[PDB]
Structure 1
Amino acid sequence: TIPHLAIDPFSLDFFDDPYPDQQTLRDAGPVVYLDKWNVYGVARYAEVHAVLNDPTTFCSSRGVGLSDFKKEKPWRPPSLILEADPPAHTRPRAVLSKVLSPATMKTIRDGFAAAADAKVDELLQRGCIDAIADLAEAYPLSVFPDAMGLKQEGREHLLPYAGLVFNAFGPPNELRQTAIERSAPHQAYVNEQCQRPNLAPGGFGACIHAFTDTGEITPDEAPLLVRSLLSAGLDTTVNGIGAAVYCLARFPGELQRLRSDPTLARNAFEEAVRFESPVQTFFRTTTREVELGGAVIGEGEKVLMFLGSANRDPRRWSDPDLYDITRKTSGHVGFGSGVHMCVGQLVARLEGEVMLSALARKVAAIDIDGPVKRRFNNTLRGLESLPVKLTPA
């Protein structure tokens, strides 16, 4: 009753061009079984959304990667928010929500916007740049470690640590195994910076520690919540902003619409999150036998959610394969959905908005002018190198 497929969604051939295999996965049925890894898959919007919004049946505390924490030891202590279920999830989630809140965004917006305009001005002076290293990586590196309150020394560990985190959600393939092999120095740097004395006053890290006296978290929880922001908060935005720039480089008509109304910058970024889905996949584990789209899934089974495929499901989206900066994107699952829906989405959107605003006001054209190289990661979709020529407006 459930179709069995041999597609490996963690293979380099799939990362290289996932869209045919995603259609195959959607059209095979609402629930597939992936024989390569012995997990269930859901690739349509309706089932991805249903799974995300039933945390009791499809839990996160057994790990949101392939590994089942009830069977194997996690490679690092579980995240107190991503890898927790209600009710343990609830109060740590409330603390990060207040740390990364609307009020916080007001304190950081002017500096994030200045840094974005400055970076685009700098890049227009060079003309031909790499939109990954010089822009999608450089701009978040110029604002986010400072917003965390991190010291200068050791920041080169941040992107390696995040690549490790996102590879470690995957199955035990060579991407995962090599990342873990190399991990010790990046873990040791990250874990150290999570301690209260190492986080500068006023930053997100110190704000987490400052919340340890309200009864929501205790002091011994705050290092791991800082770890969550140092895991999720940089590399995701690198690939979100890289997605948007790639979209604008491929779809010049849409750069032109964005130039003509820079207030489209925030929706242009949202649409790039839908269109590319920087965070491709997460897993759940079933806590009971459950009927999902006619298929009966047993207890204790891993379920792989294809967020990017749900975001390109023609059963939900008109012309899903078109980048449309005036699309009504509400409902996409590029940030998740439900109780774990990205708690950092206001930081993500603020960064993406102020960078696309800078491009809209300052850049007349973005032309690819070199070989495009794709970066392979078990969870993140994005580019290694994106050589572009920027023409000034």
Structure 2
Amino acid sequence: TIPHLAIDPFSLDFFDDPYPDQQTLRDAGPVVYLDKWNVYGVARYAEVHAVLNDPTTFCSSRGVGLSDFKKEKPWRPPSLILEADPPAHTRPRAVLSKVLSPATMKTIRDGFAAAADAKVDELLQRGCIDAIADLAEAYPLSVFPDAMGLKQEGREHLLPYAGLVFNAFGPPNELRQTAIERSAPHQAYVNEQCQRPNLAPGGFGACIHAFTDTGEITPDEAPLLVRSLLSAGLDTTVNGIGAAVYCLARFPGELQRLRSDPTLARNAFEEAVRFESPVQTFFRTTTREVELGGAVIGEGEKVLMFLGSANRDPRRWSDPDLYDITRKTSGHVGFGSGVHMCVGQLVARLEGEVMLSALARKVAAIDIDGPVKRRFNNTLRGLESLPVKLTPA
């Protein structure tokens, strides 16, 4: 019944150009079996959306990587939010939702916008820059560690730690093995900063610890929830912003539409999240036998969801392979969907909006002017180097 495919979605050849294989995965059927890793796969929009919104059968507490926590030891203590199901998920989720709330965005907006404006003006004085190191990495590094309340010492471990986190959701390939091996110094840095004395009052970390007073989380839960923000809160935005700049560099007509109406910045960023899908894949584990796409999946099976594929499925999207900054993007799964839908989405969108606003108001053209290099990661899609020349407006 179910088609068996040999495609390795975690191979460098797949990362280098995933789109033909993603069509093969969609068109093979609503559910496939990936023989390379002994997992089920769903790559169409409808089934990806259905699985994400069925948490009692497609659970997260057995891990959202390939590893099944019922079978193998997690490489670090489980996340209290990402790797938890309701009801254990609910109060930790509520704390992060409140720490990263609409009201909280008012406190950081002016600084985040000012830093984006200043960065674009700085890059315009240089002309020829790397949109990854000098923009997609530099801007989040300039605002997010500070908004967390992190000390200065040790921040060089943040991106390596996140690279490890996202590689570790993958299969035990070379990317994962290399990431986990000798990772203790990155772990030790992050785990130390999660302790309350190391977090500046008023920042996201200290605010998490302040919620221990309410009964929503205990004091021993707070460091792990700070850890969640230090795991997911930086490298995602690096690849999201890099994706947006790469889109604007490749689609000059859309950069010009954004210039003409900078209030399209928020949706231009959202469209970049759909179009590139910085988070490409993750897993669920079945808690029971379940029919999906006409396949009977047994209990305790891993199911791989192709978020980027769902976001390009022509069954759902018109002209899926076009970047369109006025597209109605609502419903894309680049931030997930359902009970685990990105709790940091307001921070991600704030960063993306204010950077694209600064570009819209200050830049007339973005021209690739050196070799583009891809950055390989088992979960994240993005570039290692994006040399561009910025022409001022």
TM-score, normalised via structure 1 length: 1.00
Residue 170 of structure 1 and its aligned partner are, at CA, apart by: 0.1
Residue 182 of structure 1 and its aligned partner are, at CA, apart by: 2.9
The gaps in structure 1 that reach 5 residues or longer are: none
Q: Over the residues paired in the alignment, what is the CA RMSD in angstroms?
A: 0.3
CA distance in 2, matches of 1:79, 1:267: 31
**Residues 188-208 of structure 1: CA deviation (Å, up to 9, x unaligned):** 000000000000010000000
**SS of alignment partner, residue 150 of structure 2:** coil
CA distance in 2, matches of 1:150, 1:171: 31
CA distance in 2, matches of 1:183, 1:349: 30
**Residues 180-233 of structure 1: CA deviation (Å, up to 9, x unaligned):** 013111000000000000000100000000000111100000000000000000
**Residues 208-263 of structure 1: CA deviation (Å, up to 9, x unaligned):** 00000111100000000000000000000000000000000000000000000000
CA distance in 1, matches of 2:95, 2:151: 23
**SS of alignment partner, residue 391 of structure 2:** strand
CA distance in 1, matches of 2:243, 2:266: 14
Cross-structure match for 1:21: 21
**Residues 297-320 of structure 1: CA deviation (Å, up to 9, x unaligned):** 000000000000000000000000
**Residues 95-123 of structure 1: CA deviation (Å, up to 9, x unaligned):** 00000000000000000000000000000
CA distance in 2, matches of 1:93, 1:119: 33
**Residues 326-377 of structure 1: CA deviation (Å, up to 9, x unaligned):** 0000000000000000000000000000000000000000000000000000
Instruction: Tell me whether 1:34 sits opposite 2:34 in the alignment.
Output: yes
**Number of residues paired by the alignment?**
393
CA distance in 1, matches of 2:109, 2:78: 32
**SS of alignment partner, residue 366 of structure 1:** strand
Residue 173 of structure 1 and its aligned partner are, at CA, apart by: 0.2
TM-score, normalised via structure 2 length: 1.00
- Divergent runs of 4+, >6 A: none
CA distance in 2, matches of 1:99, 1:198: 18
**SS of alignment partner, residue 391 of structure 1:** strand
Residue 293 of structure 1 and its aligned partner are, at CA, apart by: 1.2
The gaps in structure 2 that reach 5 residues or longer are: none
**SS of alignment partner, residue 296 of structure 2:** strand
CA distance in 1, matches of 2:215, 2:319: 48
CA distance in 2, matches of 1:99, 1:33: 40
**Residues 150-170 of structure 1: CA deviation (Å, up to 9, x unaligned):** 000100000000000000000
CA distance in 1, matches of 2:390, 2:317: 32
Residue 281 of structure 1 and its aligned partner are, at CA, apart by: 0.5
1:138-177 matches, within 5 Å, as 138-177=138-177
CA distance in 1, matches of 2:197, 2:101: 23
Q: Identity of paired residues, percent?
A: 100
1:45-124 matches, within 5 Å, as 45-124=45-124
